[PDB]
Amino acid sequence: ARPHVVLLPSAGMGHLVPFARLAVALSEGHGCNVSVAAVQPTVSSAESRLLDALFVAAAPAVRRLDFRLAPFDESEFPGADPFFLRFEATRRSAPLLGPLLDAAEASALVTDIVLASVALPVARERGVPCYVLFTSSAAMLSLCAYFPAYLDAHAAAGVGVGNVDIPGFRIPKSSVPQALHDPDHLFTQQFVANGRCLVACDGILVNTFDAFEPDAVTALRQGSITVSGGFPPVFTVGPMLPVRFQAEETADYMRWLSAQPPRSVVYVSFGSRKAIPRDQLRELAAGLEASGKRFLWVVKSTIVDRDDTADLGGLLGDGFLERVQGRAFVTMGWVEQEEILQHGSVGLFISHCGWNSLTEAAAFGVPVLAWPRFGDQRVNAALVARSGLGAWEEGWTWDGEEGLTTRKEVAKKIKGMMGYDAVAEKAAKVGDAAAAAIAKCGTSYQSLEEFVQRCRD
């Protein structure tokens, strides 16, 4: 009999992608029936394309479960981004999960970490085991678990964050996610509320492998990060592989990559939606041109779902596009990043250190030039450097900090990463370890097997 696992992803590709990969790992790898609770329509076209692809490619084990949201008035948060508005509407619809869980006849609920505080009580009331999928690194999970206790210790009767010493490394004050400094920030309220409820759930799934973050996983497993010493089991199931889809047309960028020599291309992406200020963007563009390397650069518009091919001329100038025409592919369109990373022609990935991108780089042994921008990115950047996955210049500024990282710094960094043999070798070693972990008898496979075991019981 196939256990029925219900998945509850939050909005955005950062959340949906891991959920989609987990759905396949459970169904194809471990014989589960998986239902993805999905709200229609999606906030963005990429999520909609991903769901449509997932339901066809993973049929019939992976299925759509329609989730109807309670009416939400967007006037409460004027000017708020559509992803946050979808998240808040979902959070308020948490009581509607109870009828959905009973209709689903769920063996277990796997809730997104951002919805955990509201999902867990509903699951608890219905007697359904509730597990949490954490979308970032084990280091971020340890910070998330520890942060409420850290705040409580500093709560004198009658603000911001300093160095956070997680029991069992130090997150320096400049690496703390910027929103956490403001206690009233919406990100901060959810980060604390979700962190507080982690100890009360059945288990936590993390898209990482024990060899990648040995200290963070050990501390979580030992319960070092909580006042009581109690913590639920931690399943290291990463890096989850990309879903196998069938494309019917090869994309131009893939064709362009094929025309380039092995490991000659620097791929540049700052994630699913990060958009950068014109001054930083100019330095980045100039740095790339100055490097002399072939590059594939994906630029994100500030408007969701806008493919602004003409904005390239407005944003960077016609001259830059003209000058780099023979060695670069620059686009504002969505690309299938997982495919690009598996291509032999890619030698370097300049990334924002979003966890999903990092897992993809780790899985394929691609060196990463870490350029963290906000949130968990600096914490993730440190992992890239320590692991040997890539290099991080700590001095480069991030959002809210003064000072432009120049074209010269970018060019030197790119040239060095491409130039030095050790960088590719170290990244390859990370790939080898990740491959060992996800294989049969590997720690990640073992974790998934144990998790499904509990679902069968």
Ligand X SMILES: O=c1ccn([C@@H]2O[C@H](COP(=O)(O)OP(=O)(O)O)[C@@H](O)[C@H]2O)c(=O)[nH]1
Residue 168 among known ligand-binding residues: no
Residue 272 found at the interface with ligand X (CB under 6 A): yes
Residue 195 found at the interface with ligand X (CB under 6 A): no
Contact by Cβ (8 Å): 300, 273: yes
Of 148, 287, 354, 390, which lies in the binding site for ligand X, with binding defined by CB under 6 A?
354
Of 43, 360, 378, 410, which lies in the binding site for ligand X, with binding defined by CB under 6 A?
360
SS3 assignment, position 270: coil
CB of 137 to ligand X, least distance (A): 10
Strands 203-206 and 130-134: parallel
CB of 305 to ligand X, least distance (A): 12
CB of 26 to ligand X, least distance (A): 18
C-alpha 313 chain-centroid distance: 30
Contact by Cβ (8 Å): 354, 360: no
Taking alpha carbons only, the member of 264, 318, 325, 334 closest to residue 289 is 325
β-bridge partners, 349: 267, 368
Of 207, 356, 387, 444, which lies in the binding site for ligand X, with binding defined by CB under 6 A?
356
Residue 114 among known ligand-binding residues: no
Beta carbon nearer to ligand X, 97 or 138: 138
CB atoms within 10 A of CB 279: 9
Q: What is the DSSP letter of 249?
A: S
CB of 239 to ligand X, least distance (A): 11
Residue 374 among known ligand-binding residues: yes
Question: Which residue stretch of 10-18, 74-82, 104-112, 183-191 sits at the interface with ligand X (rule: CB under 6 A)?
Answer: 10-18
Taking alpha carbons only, the member of 355, 423, 401, 308 closest to residue 137 is 355
CB of 31 to ligand X, least distance (A): 25
Beta carbon nearer to ligand X, 210 or 338: 338
Size of the site for ligand X (CB under 6 A): 19
Of 202, 283, 289, 338, which lies in the binding site for ligand X, with binding defined by CB under 6 A?
338
Q: What are phi and psi of 63, to 5 degrees?
A: -130, 155
Alpha helix locations (H) across 76-185?
82-92, 97-104, 116-126, 138-153
CB of 270 to ligand X, least distance (A): 7
Beta carbon nearer to ligand X, 280 or 446: 280
Residue 301 among known ligand-binding residues: no
Residue 208 found at the interface with ligand X (CB under 6 A): no
Residue 47 found at the interface with ligand X (CB under 6 A): no
Report the distance separating Cα 434 and Cα 362, nearest Å. 7
Report the distance separating Cα 43 and Cα 157, nearest Å. 42
Beta carbon nearer to ligand X, 27 or 337: 337
Q: Is 361 left (phi over 0), alpha (psi -120 to 50) or beta?
A: alpha
Structure tokens that stand for 210 in this block = 């024990």
Of 251, 335, 424, 428, which lies in the binding site for ligand X, with binding defined by CB under 6 A?
335
Residue 359 among known ligand-binding residues: yes
SS3 assignment, position 62: strand
Overall size of the chain counted in residues: 457
Beta carbon nearer to ligand X, 269 or 444: 269
Residue 14 found at the interface with ligand X (CB under 6 A): yes
Query: Which amino acid belongs to residue 338?
Result: E
Contact by Cβ (8 Å): 66, 38: yes
Beta carbon nearer to ligand X, 285 or 411: 285
CB atoms within 10 A of CB 416: 13
Give the list of residues 6+ apart from residue 243 with CB closer than 8 angstroms, or none.
20, 21, 24, 53, 54, 57, 58
- Residue 276-315 contact track with ligand X, rule CB under 6 A, x = bound: ----------------------x-----------------
Residue 372 found at the interface with ligand X (CB under 6 A): no
Strands 170-171 and 164-165: antiparallel
Q: What angle do CA 130, 134, 136 make, to 5 degrees?
A: 180
Of 81, 336, 409, 450, which lies in the binding site for ligand X, with binding defined by CB under 6 A?
336
Residue 129 found at the interface with ligand X (CB under 6 A): no
Question: Which residue stretch of 68-76, 152-160, 349-357, 381-389 sits at the interface with ligand X (rule: CB under 6 A)?
Answer: 349-357
Residue 17 found at the interface with ligand X (CB under 6 A): yes
Beta carbon nearer to ligand X, 107 or 236: 236
Q: Which residues are annotated as a binding site for UDP-alpha-D-glucose?
A: 272, 334-335, 352-360, 374-377
By CB under 6 A, name the binding residues for ligand X: 13-14, 17, 269, 271-274, 298, 334-338, 354-357, 360
